[PDB]
Amino acid sequence: IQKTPQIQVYSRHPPENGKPNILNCYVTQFHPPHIEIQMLKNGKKIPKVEMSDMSFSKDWSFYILAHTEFTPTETDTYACRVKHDSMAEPKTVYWDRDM
Amino acid sequence: WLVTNGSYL
Amino acid sequence: GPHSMRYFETAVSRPGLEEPRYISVGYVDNKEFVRFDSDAENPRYEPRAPWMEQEGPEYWERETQKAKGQEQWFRVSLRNLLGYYNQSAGGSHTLQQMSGCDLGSDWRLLRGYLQFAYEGRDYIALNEDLKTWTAADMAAQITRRKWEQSGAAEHYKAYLEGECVEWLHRYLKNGNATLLRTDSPKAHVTHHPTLRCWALGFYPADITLTWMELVETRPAGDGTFQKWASVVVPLGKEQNYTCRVYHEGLPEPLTLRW
């Protein structure tokens, strides 16, 4: 059977408005390994998003880290979008900048 | 150093 | 203290294709030092740690050829599991393996590990005696009978008391400096409408934050990690709690408040 992904979305460095940073979508605890991840800005997909290399954990579930550069502002919203067979439809996760 | 598997499953 | 080496292998069958995807990852003390992935145009075993570039060409050629042999081994074993479980090759299936060894405080072999999972669930595992197998279900019992008849356990026990300990001793000598490193976390506290303690930039991942909600430890991408833990304060009472962070990189545990 299949394990549904858990998702965290966060910057590598504490966000400053206007300062170049990196957005992380950290996806864990899932199975089967095949998964599709996207990054969104004001509802719009970001190209070039780099996947990490995939690993799995002691309990056998898979994980992976997607990251793309970004420049936070006071207004734009950011989010991560995960498609996986354990879910009848993809899951989107807003980027909260103090989470 | 990677182990080499024996008999197949 | 102890030390360990592990290899995490993954094969995924691809419908209508002969070759599954095969990924193999090495770990010394839970830190990735090598990786192979059949997805590359010219797949080759590769160092993931600075200290692994001390090894010469025969090493990487040999590990590469071994990995192609393991890709074939998983392709066979996948075909067999379709029969044990009466599945169709039209579907994608997943086989995983964990192998390696833990050295005790005396650097002698403490425990060997060899275990397999199918569809992400335990299938068969070599026991602590490196002699007997534990099978997870009726299908794995087929494999266990097979491996008893073939004496496969001996092959593995030889590797585990063999090459595993040797090469681990050498990976420890090579990786010494890097592997002992600790980056101390940098911490601070934020207020919300709820106070939050941030530990950022720390390695290794083991850390304790104590004031409450908390998030699983997360990679920053840069070789360090992050965590936070928070409370809901009584909105008028400030300095509602003190935040302590204990991590083996800190000269002393930190203490913070908003």
Numbering used by the authors:
A (entry chain B): 1 to 99
B (entry chain C): 1 to 9
C (entry chain A): 1 to 193, 200 to 217, 228 to 274
Extract from the study:
Specific recognition and elimination of tumors and/or pathogen-infected cells by cytolytic CD8+ T lymphocytes (CTLs) critically relies on the presentation of antigenic peptides by MHC class I molecules (MHC-I) at the cell surface. The crystal structures of H-2Db in complex with the LCMV-derived peptides GP92 (CSANNSHHYI) and GP392 (WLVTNGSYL) were refined to 2.4 and 2.5 Å resolution, respectively. The overall structures of the complexes are very similar to each other and display the classical configuration for MHC-I/peptide complexes with both epitopes bound within the peptide binding cleft. In both complexes, the fifth peptide residue (asparagine p5N) and the C-terminal residue act as anchor positions, binding to the C- and F-pockets in H-2Db, respectively.
The nonameric GP392 binds to the peptide binding cleft in a classical elongated conformation. Similarly to GP92, GP392 utilizes residues p5N and p9L as main anchor residues. Residues p5N and p9L use approximately the same hydrogen bond pattern as GP92, besides two hydrogen bonds that are missing due to a shift in the main chain oxygen of residue p4N causing the distance to H155 and Y156 to increase. It should be noted that the leucine residue p9L is considered as a weaker anchor in the F-pocket, compared to strong anchors such as isoleucine or methionine, with a following reduction in hydrophobic interactions. In contrast to GP92, the crystal structure of H-2Db/GP392 indicates that the asparagine residue p5N that can be glycosylated is essential for peptide binding to H-2Db. Addition of the sugar not only disrupts the fork-like hydrogen bonds formed between p5N and the H-2Db residue Q97, but also transforms the glycosylated p5N position into a much larger residue unsuitable for binding into pocket C. Analysis of the crystal structure also reveals the presence on the bottom of the peptide-binding cleft of the negatively charged residue D9, which renders pocket C (also formed by residues Q70 and Q97) more acidic. Thus, pocket C is a perfect docking site for polar uncharged asparagine residues whereas modification to a negatively charged aspartate is unfavorable. However, the glycine residue at position 6 cannot act as an anchoring position substitute as in the complex of H-2Db with K2G, providing a possible explanation to its much weaker affinity to H-2Db, compared to GP392.
